[PDB]
Structure 1
Amino acid sequence: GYGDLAATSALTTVIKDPISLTIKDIYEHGVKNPFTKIIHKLKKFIRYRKVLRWSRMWWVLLVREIVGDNTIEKKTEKALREIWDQCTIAVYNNTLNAVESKPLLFLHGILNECRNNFATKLRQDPSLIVAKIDQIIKSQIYRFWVSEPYLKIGRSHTLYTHITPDAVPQLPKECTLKHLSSYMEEKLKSM
């Protein structure tokens, strides 16, 4: 009889077609997508070594000036570090000058671009990320970002993952936004 080939055709697709569709999500969401995020993380590491020695050296100085020593949330500091790394890749691809040669050209790129890059995606900044990068540029505080200790670590052969906020020396109190904003209320509220 043909009821014998009924169950052979039954338990063919009872076991093939579920397992065929589980693998299309296990391979896509659990094998494809992490393995690309390992490769495209390595493409930031095989390239872009000379840039991220300086970029993470600048990004720590934003985190110190926008926050101002009032404990920084670690989870979304690394989420905006990726947007800061996208400003540097976008600037460094537009330069013929080396990063080691002329570094204050790059801060007029990287701060001006993340002034605009954070202003096109961050809707509301109660920490004022766009508004403070405005007056780091429009009052030129990024002078002191290049100093004697900041060029030594910038020229050094250290990987950018080893650049921590512990390894970056702090700016003196004359050189921060906390002083320069309070110094204007010493003028403009008095005047």
Structure 2
Amino acid sequence: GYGDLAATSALTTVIKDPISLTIKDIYEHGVKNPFTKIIHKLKKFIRYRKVLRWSRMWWVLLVREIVGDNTIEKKTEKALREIWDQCTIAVYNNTLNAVESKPLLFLHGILNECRNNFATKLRQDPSLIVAKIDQIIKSQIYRFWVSEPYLKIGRSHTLYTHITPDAVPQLPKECTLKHLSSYMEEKLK
């Protein structure tokens, strides 16, 4: 009869077509988008491993300058470390000079890159991230981020994943922005 073709070619359709659509979403969102996430996490390790030693180190100091002994969020560092890493990736492709050979050229390059990269992304700054990086450039107190305790970490062979806030020693209180902003208001008032 002709009812078996209506029995067979329908079940051929109702089985092949939903599963071809479910595998498509399992492939694109469950395989391919996590897979593409992995290689571009690897591409910051095969290249760029020398800058991110100096980059994550200058970011650990910068989070201490923005916040200054208050509880930092461990989760939205990760939103802002990616923007800080994209500042150093953008600067190190623009410099023929080495990072270890001339380090403050990068601090003027990286901080000004994320003085504007934060300004084009962060609309509201309750912690004043663009505003404080303005005054670190404008008052040149980022010269303490490159000092004799700090040049030892950036020369040493530590991968950037190993660099924690504990490995970076704290700046003296006379060097940080919080005492700079307090001593300013004392003088001007």
Same fold (TM over 0.5): yes
| Deviation for aligned residue 1:78 | 1.4
Deviations 1:80-106 (A, max 9, x none): 000000000000000000001000000
RMSD over aligned Cα atoms: 0.5
More helix by share: 1
- Separation of aligned partners in 2, 1:36 and 1:180: 44
After TM superposition, the runs of 4+ consecutive aligned structure 1 residues lying more than 2 A away are none
Partner of 1:51: 51
| Deviation for aligned residue 1:79 | 1.0
- Separation of aligned partners in 1, 2:35 and 2:115: 32
- Separation of aligned partners in 1, 2:144 and 2:51: 19
| Deviation for aligned residue 1:4 | 1.3
3-state SS, counterpart of residue 185 of structure 2: helix
Partner of 1:34: 34
What TM-score do you get using the length of structure 2 for normalisation? 0.99
5+ residue gaps, structure 2: none
Deviations 1:48-95 (A, max 9, x none): 011001000100001101000101000001110000000000000000
- Separation of aligned partners in 1, 2:35 and 2:14: 31
| Deviation for aligned residue 1:187 | 0.6
Deviations 1:155-177 (A, max 9, x none): 00110000000110000000011
- Separation of aligned partners in 2, 1:185 and 1:99: 36
The alignment of Structure 1 onto Structure 2 pairs a total of residues equal to 189
3-state SS, counterpart of residue 76 of structure 2: helix
| Deviation for aligned residue 1:185 | 1.1
Partner of 2:14: 14
- Separation of aligned partners in 2, 1:31 and 1:131: 41
5+ residue gaps, structure 1: none
| Deviation for aligned residue 1:120 | 0.3
What TM-score do you get using the length of structure 1 for normalisation? 0.98
- Separation of aligned partners in 2, 1:57 and 1:149: 12
